[PDB]
Design a protein around this motif. Structure first.
Motif, PDB file in Angstrom:
ATOM      1  N   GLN D 241      -3.082  96.516 -40.828  1.00  0.00           N
ATOM      2  CA  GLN D 241      -2.665  97.659 -40.006  1.00  0.00           C
ATOM      3  C   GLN D 241      -3.376  98.135 -38.784  1.00  0.00           C
ATOM      4  OE1 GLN D 241      -0.595 100.083 -39.447  1.00  0.00           O
ATOM      5  NE2 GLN D 241       1.057  99.327 -41.350  1.00  0.00           N
ATOM      6  N   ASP D 242      -2.912  98.384 -37.643  1.00  0.00           N
ATOM      7  CA  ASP D 242      -3.860  99.069 -36.503  1.00  0.00           C
ATOM      8  C   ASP D 242      -4.409  99.918 -36.743  1.00  0.00           C
ATOM      9  OD1 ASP D 242      -3.713  96.150 -35.545  1.00  0.00           O
ATOM     10  OD2 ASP D 242      -3.311  96.618 -33.181  1.00  0.00           O
ATOM     11  N   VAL D 243      -5.085 100.629 -37.528  1.00  0.00           N
ATOM     12  CA  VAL D 243      -5.794 101.472 -37.230  1.00  0.00           C
ATOM     13  C   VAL D 243      -6.908 102.000 -35.836  1.00  0.00           C
ATOM     14  CG1 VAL D 243      -7.119 103.176 -39.233  1.00  0.00           C
ATOM     15  CG2 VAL D 243      -6.054 100.680 -39.843  1.00  0.00           C
ATOM     16  N   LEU D 244      -6.512 103.641 -36.051  1.00  0.00           N
ATOM     17  CA  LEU D 244      -7.477 104.249 -35.726  1.00  0.00           C
ATOM     18  C   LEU D 244      -8.293 105.398 -36.203  1.00  0.00           C
ATOM     19  CD1 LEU D 244      -4.945 105.907 -33.322  1.00  0.00           C
ATOM     20  CD2 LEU D 244      -7.022 105.207 -32.495  1.00  0.00           C
ATOM     21  N   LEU D 245      -9.590 105.141 -35.997  1.00  0.00           N
ATOM     22  CA  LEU D 245     -10.297 106.242 -37.288  1.00  0.00           C
ATOM     23  C   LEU D 245     -11.485 107.224 -36.254  1.00  0.00           C
ATOM     24  CD1 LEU D 245     -12.106 106.362 -39.686  1.00  0.00           C
ATOM     25  CD2 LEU D 245     -13.817 105.070 -38.645  1.00  0.00           C
ATOM     26  N   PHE D 246     -11.132 108.195 -36.225  1.00  0.00           N
ATOM     27  CA  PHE D 246     -12.111 109.670 -35.820  1.00  0.00           C
ATOM     28  C   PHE D 246     -13.622 110.475 -36.973  1.00  0.00           C
ATOM     29  CE2 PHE D 246      -7.596 109.055 -33.642  1.00  0.00           C
ATOM     30  CZ  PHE D 246      -7.880 109.110 -32.472  1.00  0.00           C
ATOM     31  N   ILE D 247     -13.964 110.455 -35.972  1.00  0.00           N
ATOM     32  CA  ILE D 247     -14.989 111.246 -37.282  1.00  0.00           C
ATOM     33  C   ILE D 247     -15.714 111.639 -36.602  1.00  0.00           C
ATOM     34  CG2 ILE D 247     -17.272 110.319 -38.212  1.00  0.00           C
ATOM     35  CD1 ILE D 247     -16.249 107.280 -38.174  1.00  0.00           C
ATOM     36  N   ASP D 248     -15.879 112.957 -36.573  1.00  0.00           N
ATOM     37  CA  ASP D 248     -16.653 114.148 -36.199  1.00  0.00           C
ATOM     38  C   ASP D 248     -17.426 114.352 -37.567  1.00  0.00           C
ATOM     39  OD1 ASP D 248     -16.976 116.025 -34.006  1.00  0.00           O
ATOM     40  OD2 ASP D 248     -15.131 116.959 -34.264  1.00  0.00           O
ATOM     41  N   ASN D 249     -18.703 114.413 -37.014  1.00  0.00           N
ATOM     42  CA  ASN D 249     -19.449 113.989 -36.149  1.00  0.00           C
ATOM     43  C   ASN D 249     -20.803 112.734 -37.017  1.00  0.00           C
ATOM     44  OD1 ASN D 249     -22.084 114.372 -34.397  1.00  0.00           O
ATOM     45  ND2 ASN D 249     -20.065 114.810 -33.547  1.00  0.00           N
ATOM     46  N   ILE D 250     -20.580 111.392 -36.307  1.00  0.00           N
ATOM     47  CA  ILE D 250     -22.338 110.823 -36.988  1.00  0.00           C
ATOM     48  C   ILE D 250     -23.118 110.979 -37.523  1.00  0.00           C
ATOM     49  CG2 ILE D 250     -21.069 109.073 -35.934  1.00  0.00           C
ATOM     50  CD1 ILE D 250     -20.235 107.904 -39.123  1.00  0.00           C
ATOM     51  N   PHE D 251     -23.631 112.361 -36.145  1.00  0.00           N
ATOM     52  CA  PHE D 251     -24.903 111.803 -36.281  1.00  0.00           C
ATOM     53  C   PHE D 251     -25.238 113.072 -38.112  1.00  0.00           C
ATOM     54  CE2 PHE D 251     -27.527 115.690 -35.942  1.00  0.00           C
ATOM     55  CZ  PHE D 251     -28.234 114.960 -35.413  1.00  0.00           C
ATOM     56  N   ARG D 252     -23.833 114.267 -38.179  1.00  0.00           N
ATOM     57  CA  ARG D 252     -24.498 114.944 -39.574  1.00  0.00           C
ATOM     58  C   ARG D 252     -25.016 113.599 -40.784  1.00  0.00           C
ATOM     59  NH1 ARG D 252     -26.290 119.222 -36.709  1.00  0.00           N
ATOM     60  NH2 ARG D 252     -24.524 119.884 -35.986  1.00  0.00           N
ATOM     61  N   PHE D 253     -24.339 112.546 -40.770  1.00  0.00           N
ATOM     62  CA  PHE D 253     -24.493 111.207 -41.231  1.00  0.00           C
ATOM     63  C   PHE D 253     -26.102 111.170 -41.943  1.00  0.00           C
ATOM     64  CE2 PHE D 253     -24.376 107.276 -43.857  1.00  0.00           C
ATOM     65  CZ  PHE D 253     -25.188 106.438 -43.459  1.00  0.00           C
ATOM     66  N   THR D 254     -26.645 110.919 -40.517  1.00  0.00           N
ATOM     67  CA  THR D 254     -27.654 110.735 -39.873  1.00  0.00           C
ATOM     68  C   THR D 254     -28.992 111.583 -40.870  1.00  0.00           C
ATOM     69  OG1 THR D 254     -27.441 108.640 -38.725  1.00  0.00           O
ATOM     70  CG2 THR D 254     -29.697 109.297 -39.546  1.00  0.00           C
ATOM     71  N   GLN D 255     -28.404 113.237 -40.037  1.00  0.00           N
ATOM     72  CA  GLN D 255     -29.409 114.116 -40.916  1.00  0.00           C
ATOM     73  C   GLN D 255     -29.104 114.286 -41.886  1.00  0.00           C
ATOM     74  OE1 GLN D 255     -27.174 118.095 -39.442  1.00  0.00           O
ATOM     75  NE2 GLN D 255     -29.141 118.102 -38.174  1.00  0.00           N
ATOM     76  N   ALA D 256     -28.117 113.869 -42.789  1.00  0.00           N
ATOM     77  CA  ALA D 256     -28.547 114.234 -43.687  1.00  0.00           C
ATOM     78  C   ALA D 256     -29.271 112.852 -44.596  1.00  0.00           C
ATOM     79  CB  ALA D 256     -26.452 113.858 -44.136  1.00  0.00           C
ATOM     80  N   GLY D 257     -29.374 112.507 -44.241  1.00  0.00           N
ATOM     81  CA  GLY D 257     -30.685 110.990 -44.547  1.00  0.00           C
ATOM     82  C   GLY D 257     -31.365 112.080 -44.691  1.00  0.00           C
TER      83      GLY D 257
END
Lengths: 492, 467, 48, 466
Positions: D241-257
């Motif tokens: 399938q042709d997907v569309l992937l929206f993420i708000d906010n990927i900075f938060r993943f790093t911050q979580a880390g």
């Protein structure tokens, strides 16, 4: 008496986390030796402590658990080397990643070998033509030379390197084996799709045949990214030590430093300036000293390195940036300001240098660009000092008139590396004043017209300049004749 | 004594002795190696274990490996048979020409000359370089320092001084390459030979060489300067001669130390440096000196990290010099070579009582105008030049011409400038500036003053430019 | 004379504003360098 | 296997096992709790102890408490039955609509597609946004990133793109809310329902929603991206399938880390971040990609702390994108929306051989004039325009008109622009910008160009301004 797991040639994982194994046993390992994990995963012995061995893991530590058996290899880390690798894409250890079959390697080489000393080398004298006027005319690169490509994200650093690799077909498709240059392209911290894009273009340019691509990308373990440069270097020394010529691009040495920093902090080695190990200078000096020109006594081969470093906010004074600028034999500094302004390559004349000078240039080129560099430096200054036409004399009006025309000639597109005689023809036109009355805006168009003319009609003058390698008195006269007349018909 | 290796972590190796603990500074040799590996004892950790710094690669060492106390600090072949040769940190020839058959050997570690051994003679040492001579004269037997960030001219400047001074010098010369480029030691060696300063056939060599380049482990880099300096002290004391000492680059000695510092278990001082930076520098810099016995004329290249002159290292070194030549990327960037900063370079002999008032009034005269112009620069930048007093637009003029007259084509940078190298004599310098300052050339164009030797070339160049 | 007056009123007011901003930028930078240089020392010391 | 809780510090729970130590990444279930508490193993400290990261608040845990090895890593419902559903880090529904009844389950930790699996097709993705399309065009199956300091336009731009692109996309979409506002998840869900991309009646939903917001403990925020990511990987490879992937906010993943990193006991790297920042971004970013099996067009909002783009987080993210939209507070404050910095946004498609030279020349044309205006600004700043050259003043006029024409009203921002949202077609953008460059509107006033779609509307506005 099962005696296969004695603690002298084997050990057992005391703990594992974040890619660092603290192995117990391994009493006879040597610092920097490679070890094996039950899981077929290889690691490297970096800390030999009283009670444990700190092992850096070349892969996902998820397959390693406390208790695992670790086995010596008896070998200090090395890798496949030689002509078999050309046209292939390998990982940081030599393994193929182009799923095109095993490498038929017969030779191996330690990734970490000290650079040849004083005695085994000879001054850099043979040019290493990039195909880029700006570079080949103002910051010449010779074989055995290390020249840095440095600038912010997206200012065009990789392009310089690709154009260079592509420009080498000229000689590689030729007869002469001394003029040939095998290339190595080490991707570090980069993204797989970008590299895949990269090796595609190289293939489409028929350059893979003479290129090896060592890839240590974004998801590869820190230690692979770290090693990658030394690995690729070693593959280049094979050519260097065998009277052949190699060119290696370290793209980039910034992401490696990060990898080093990570690997190093996870080993609990106290962080230093900017969080990096106190030896990051050493990390890169050790590597780049290996690019070198060997004397005929050692084959006369060479290794030329083009390391890349990413600055932030065009700040070249930055600690890492200067650390590396103080190792190489010059730098090519690309500015985003120049780039947006239309100046591509965004080479900053004033801030770039070549510590080899004209010794890495053909006489034809030396003849035309011998003083141009300091002329353009002095031009940029007055161009600033009159951003208010302050009752300006003639010597400076002439200085601004040459400066602008010459600046237009050094401009260049992508993927079209020019031949040395082609560069000499066009710079010639400018440096001699024949273009001082043409309109700056015209210059680019003129160069395409002019070059067209001489390439098609006059290849006798191109082949002579190219061959003699110099600009004789008659060639210089046949050239004056062509430019002035074509120029006139051109400005009809 | 015989110790065993108990831990290896980079250039730092810990050794355990059963009986007889080698004193600090002692050199130990690792047994079982194709090549000679020397470990300098750095500390007594206690428990009859010493922490040491490796003088070479630590690859392949093994826990338990044997190590013999040599019973003394690194000692090297010192004497006249070092001239024309190339040595190691540890005194081994690296030129493939056989052993160095000296009568004596010296330990690279030694105390600096006492206060009552100091000398205070101050003789200007003319170099032929307009800027230096005019504004920051070097002094015979004095300590000279060339400060500069990466790629601004430290080495080339050291290169033209070897040519304009080392070459005529009747006495020895010792050039110690500390943590610099290997390519460079090969360029210099072969140049020394092609010019007979180094003679491979006879004993006419007038220069000994010592090298510990950038491809070496921190340890080697933390000591070559010592080896280099030790060779030089011999000719100073045991022969009593006039020595010329060139070190490029002494910053490397200090970076070497900062690189192992953490492995020596120390809390970092500011900027990452080790807490013993100044004292480490002091006990060394204090040996590089002229005494009543002999004279040393040291020219030390000093790297400036991040281009910041306040960095603890460059910053800590000023006090050890009698003259300083500060190079600047801002000047270099304009194409003005040598890129010396006229307002940040100094000499202890810039005294009317020593160089004379004509020399002195010109120098200060040139500096006032460059300062005067520096201040206006930022302002005519925005507000333009019309409003300026003819009195003030003349100093802009003269300054811009002086700024140029201070550049000069070096004889060691023709590959760079595309111009024949010029050496200008002290009186041609003083006079040239005296006249520019006097208004005697307000008619010639600035460009006429750029990349020329003596003032007459500026006049000739005006005509050539006249069209 | 009325246009030079006006132009110089503005220029002077722009200058002052620029002055006020650079000064505040100066203090922010001054504070961050100290903090930055100190965290660096602590990190090194704690790692031992 | 049953281990026992030995230590508890925030989200870092250390559990000891007697027989059978779970491998790293394995999910353990804490015993004796009203709700599910999954622990993800992070490392083997030795001594049969494992250090783990909790996936929910750890209050109430007690030393000696029993923990059970689940035997695998967090696994989540994957398939088409996730479409139209809202799910957790650990894959449980949170939309009060029952269990997600799927055939298969996927583990959130997978390896990234291999080199040979990569793709190199480069197709432009037109969005209808003038600045983006003209200067830093996105690309189908490419990786896009919107950099923005607080409150600059990251989310509004994702919304407008969801509207302009996701809405008429044949194929699925995955929205992963990482560390953002809960109200936003709620604002979106209900909006998705309303426009029918989420249908609670039929199986016609085209969007799967995964959320781990600003209220979760660090570990949850550190893994939801992986979770939204996995959902997307299923459609890509298991259905081509042709997907569309929206993420708000990927900075938060790093911050979580960075939040748990000290707890894991690591010497910090620069700016207090974890030494594993890049590799963590890397093995995660490398799964968000198009391949020979399927296409993933992904748009990720990247929050820039203190507005500093030199911050390790954002700084390390540039290298993973194909196109970047760098938002600026300075521009926003001028009233230009979207507040895109035209000289700082880029796109690997800005190649003549891909967008055509017409496009390539207007694009570089616009940047050159804005770069030129940019250098005059220092002087304009103390002395204004008076002292400027007639020629220089024309760049300034044109630059200020190009700057205004780059702004545009979004449907999604109608309540604030006071104007009706506009969608401009690429050729309309290439054109309108040509003319401006070409001096065909040097007579119109700047204000005519502000907040409009096509150039034709800029001429009109000029009449209305009279």
């Amino acid at each position: 008496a099962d005696t296969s797991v004695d603690l002298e040639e084997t050990g057992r994982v005391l703990s594992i986390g974040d890619g660092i194994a603290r192995v117990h046993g391994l009493r006879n390992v040597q610092a920097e030796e490679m070890v094996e994990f039950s899981s077929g995963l290889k690691g490297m012995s970096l800390n030999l402590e009283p009670d444990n061995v700190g092992v850096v893991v070349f892969g996902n530590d998820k397959l390693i658990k406390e208790g695992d058996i670790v086995k010596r290899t008896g070998a200090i880390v090395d890798v496949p080397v030689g002509e078999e690798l050309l046209g292939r894409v390998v990982d940081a250890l030599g393994n193929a990643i182009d799923g095109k079959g095993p490498i038929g390697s017969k030779a191996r080489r330690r990734v970490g070998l000290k650079a040849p000393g004083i005695i085994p080398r000879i001054s850099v004298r043979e040019p290493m033509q990039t195909g880029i006027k700006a570079v080949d005319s103002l910051v010449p690169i010779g074989r055995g030379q290390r020249e840095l490509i440095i600038g912010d994200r997206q200012t065009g650093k990789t392009s310089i390197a690709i154009d260079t690799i592509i420009n080498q077909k000229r000689f590689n498709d030729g007869t002469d084996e001394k003029k040939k240059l095998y290339c190595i392209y080490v991707a570090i911290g980069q993204k797989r799709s970008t590299v895949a894009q990269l090796v595609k273009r190289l293939t489409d340019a028929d350059a893979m045949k003479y290129t090896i691509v060592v890839s240590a990308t974004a998801s590869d373990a820190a230690p692979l990214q770290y090693l990658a440069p030394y690995s690729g270097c070693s593959m280049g020394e094979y050519f260097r030590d065998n009277g052949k010529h190699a060119l290696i691009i370290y793209d980039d040495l910034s992401k490696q430093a990060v990898a080093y920093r990570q690997m190093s902090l996870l080993l609990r080695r106290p962080p230093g300036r900017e969080a990096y190990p106190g030896d990051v200078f050493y990390l890169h000096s050790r590597l780049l000293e290996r690019a070198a020109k060997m004397n005929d006594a050692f084959g006369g081969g060479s290794l030329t390195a083009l390391p890349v470093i990413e600055t932030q906010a065009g700040d070249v004074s930055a600690y890492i940036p200067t650390n590396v600028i103080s190792i190489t034999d010059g730098q090519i500094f690309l500015e985003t300001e120049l780039f947006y302004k239309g100046i591509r390559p965004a080479i900053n004349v004033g801030l770039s240098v070549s510590r080899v000078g004209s010794a890495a240039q053909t006489r034809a080129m030396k003849q035309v660009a011998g003083t141009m560099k300091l002329e353009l430096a002095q031009y940029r200054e007055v161009a600033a000092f009159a951003q208010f036409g302050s009752d300006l004399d003639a010597a400076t009006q002439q200085l601004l008139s040459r400066g602008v025309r010459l600046t237009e000639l050094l401009k260049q597109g992508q993927y079209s590396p020019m031949a040395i005689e082609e560069q000499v023809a066009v710079i010639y036109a400018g440096v001699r004043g024949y273009l001082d009355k043409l309109e700056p805006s015209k210059i680019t168009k003129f160069e395409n017209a002019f070059l067209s003319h001489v390439i098609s009609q006059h290849q006798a003058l191109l082949s002579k300049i190219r061959t003699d390698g110099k600009i004789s008195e008659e060639s210089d006269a046949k050239l004056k004749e062509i430019v002035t007349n074509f120029l006139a018909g051109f400005e009809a | 004594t015989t110790g065993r290796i108990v831990a290896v972590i980079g250039a730092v190796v810990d050794v355990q002795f059963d009986e007889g603990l080698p004193p600090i500074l002692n050199a130990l040799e690792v047994q079982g190696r194709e090549t000679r590996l020397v470990l300098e004892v750095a500390q007594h950790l206690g428990e009859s274990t010493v922490r040491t710094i490796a003088m070479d690669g630590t690859e392949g060492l093994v826990r338990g490996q044997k190590v013999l106390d040599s019973g003394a600090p690194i000692r090297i072949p010192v004497g006249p048979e070092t001239l024309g040769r190339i040595m190691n940190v540890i005194g081994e020839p690296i030129d493939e020409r056989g052993p160095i058959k000296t009568k004596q050997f010296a330990a690279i570690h030694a105390e600096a000359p006492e206060f009552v051994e100091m000398s205070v003679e101050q003789e200007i040492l003319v170099t032929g370089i307009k800027v230096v001579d005019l504004l920051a004269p070097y002094a015979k037997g004095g300590k000279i320092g060339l400060f500069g960030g990466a790629g601004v001219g430290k080495t080339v400047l050291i290169m033209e001084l070897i040519n304009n001074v080392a070459k005529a010098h009747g006495g020895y010369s010792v050039f110690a390459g500390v943590g610099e480029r290997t390519r460079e030691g090969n360029d210099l060696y072969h140049e020394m030979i092609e010019s007979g300063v180094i003679n491979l056939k006879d004993a006419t060599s007038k220069v000994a060489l010592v090298y510990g380049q950038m491809n070496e482990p921190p340890g080697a880099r933390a000591r070559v300067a010592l080896t280099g300096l030790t060779v030089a002290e011999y000719f100073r004391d045991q022969e009593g001669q006039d020595v010329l000492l060139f070190i490029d680059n002494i910053f490397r000695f200090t970076q070497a130390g900062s690189e192992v510092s953490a492995l020596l278990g120390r809390i970092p001082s500011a900027v990452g440096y080790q807490p013993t930076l100044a004292t480490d520098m002091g006990t060394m810099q204090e040996r590089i000196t002229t005494t009543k016995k002999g004279s040393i004329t040291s020219v030390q290249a000093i790297y400036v990290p991040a281009d910041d002159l306040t960095d603890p290292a460059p910053a800590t070194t000023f006090a050890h010099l009698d003259a300083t030549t500060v190079l600047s990327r801002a000047i270099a960037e304009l194409g003005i070579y040598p890129a010396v900063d006229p307002l940040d370079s100094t000499s202890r002999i810039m005294d009317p009582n020593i160089v004379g008032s004509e020399h002195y009034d010109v120098a200060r005269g040139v500096q006032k105008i460059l300062q005067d112009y520096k201040s206006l620069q930022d302002i005519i930048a925005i507000l333009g030049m019309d409003e300026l007093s003819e009195e003030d637009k003349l100093t802009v003029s003269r300054a811009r011409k002086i700024q140029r007259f201070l550049s000069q084509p070096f004889q060691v940078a023709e590959v760079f400038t595309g111009h024949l190298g010029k050496l200008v004599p002290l009186k041609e310098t003083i006079k040239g500036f005296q006249q520019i300052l006097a208004g005697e050339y307000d008619h010639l164009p600035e460009q006429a003053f750029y990349m020329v030797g003596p003032i007459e070339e500026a006049v000739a160049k005006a005509d050539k430019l006249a069209e | 004379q009325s246009a030079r007056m006006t132009a110089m009123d503005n220029a002077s007011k722009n200058a002052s504003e620029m002055i006020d901003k650079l000064t505040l930028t100066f203090n922010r930078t001054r504070q961050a360098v100290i903090t930055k240089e100190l965290i660096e020392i602590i990190s090194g010391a704690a790692a031992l």
